[PDB]
Amino acid sequence: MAHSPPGHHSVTGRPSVNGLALAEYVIYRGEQAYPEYLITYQIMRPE
Amino acid sequence: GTILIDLSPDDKEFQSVEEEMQSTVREHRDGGHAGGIFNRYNILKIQKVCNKKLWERYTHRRKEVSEENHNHANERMLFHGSPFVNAIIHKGFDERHAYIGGMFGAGIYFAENSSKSNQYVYGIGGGTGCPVHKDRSCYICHRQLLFCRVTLGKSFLQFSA
Numbered sequence A: 001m002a003h004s005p006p007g008h009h010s011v012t013g014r015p016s017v018n019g020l021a022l023a024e025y026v027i028y029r030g031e032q033a034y035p036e037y038l039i040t041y042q043i044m045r046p047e
Numbered sequence B: 001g002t003i004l005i006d007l008s009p010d011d012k013e014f015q016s017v018e019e020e021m022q023s024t025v026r027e028h029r030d031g032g033h034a035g036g037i038f039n040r041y042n043i044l045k046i047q048k049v050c051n052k053k054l055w056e057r058y059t060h061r062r063k064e065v066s067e068e069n070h071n072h073a074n075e076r077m078l079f080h081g082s083p084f085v086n087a088i089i090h091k092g093f094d095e096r097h098a099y100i101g102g103m104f105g106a107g108i109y110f111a112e113n114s115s116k117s118n119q120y121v122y123g124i125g126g127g128t129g130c131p132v133h134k135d136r137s138c139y140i141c142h143r144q145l146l147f148c149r150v151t152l153g154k155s156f157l158q159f160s161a
């Protein structure tokens, strides 16, 4: 596992092409996330 | 130390988590290759993950980040998809859940789009698809995502294609 950029606690990947894409994020310490909900699902075949 | 509590579909908490799941689906540039072809999900169960030790671990670090960033944790709720969610919920996130080859370096990755994290549920690039049918687009097999509380603190802004 790498380190944060100096002076930062995470990285934000801001989408710059796909106008519809939301952000993605990276943390470098496991203690910076808590797995609050387990969601069980299936993807649905479109009509 | 982990216990899982089932949320009722009548519970407002179940409903707000489902809505975030469904409303952050998007089309992907791979036409469904990694994660499958779908516009929405069938939610089978939503469970609250309870572990005292992992939670205190989280809040301890959160306070540290906060005091380094004018009392602002910059906390988000974000999705995480992987083949190892059942280890994560018992032992917490650590360096074994790091995407060594990701765009932004060897760290632990989260998405605002649920459909993005869905691409990683069977492995990087969807791996070989579901274990039972080897179908990245399986409509039968049960999949699991985590909806996670994440401390970002001061976040480095990377513009990216």
Ligand SMILES: O=c1cc(-c2ccc(O)c(O)c2)oc2cc(O)ccc12
Pocket (backbone or CB within 6 Å): A024, B079, B080, B081, B082, B083, B084, B097, B098, B099, B100, B102, B109, B110, B111, B116, B117, B118, B120, B124
């Ligand atoms: O949910 C994610 C899981 C993972 C992921 C990647 C590699 C792993 O070995 C892993 O366990 C999870 O990667 C993502 C990358 C993104 O750009 C956005 C979300 C994820």
Ligand SMILES: [Zn+2]
Pocket (backbone or CB within 6 Å): B130, B131, B132, B133, B134, B135, B138, B139, B140, B141
């Ligand atoms: Zn299957």
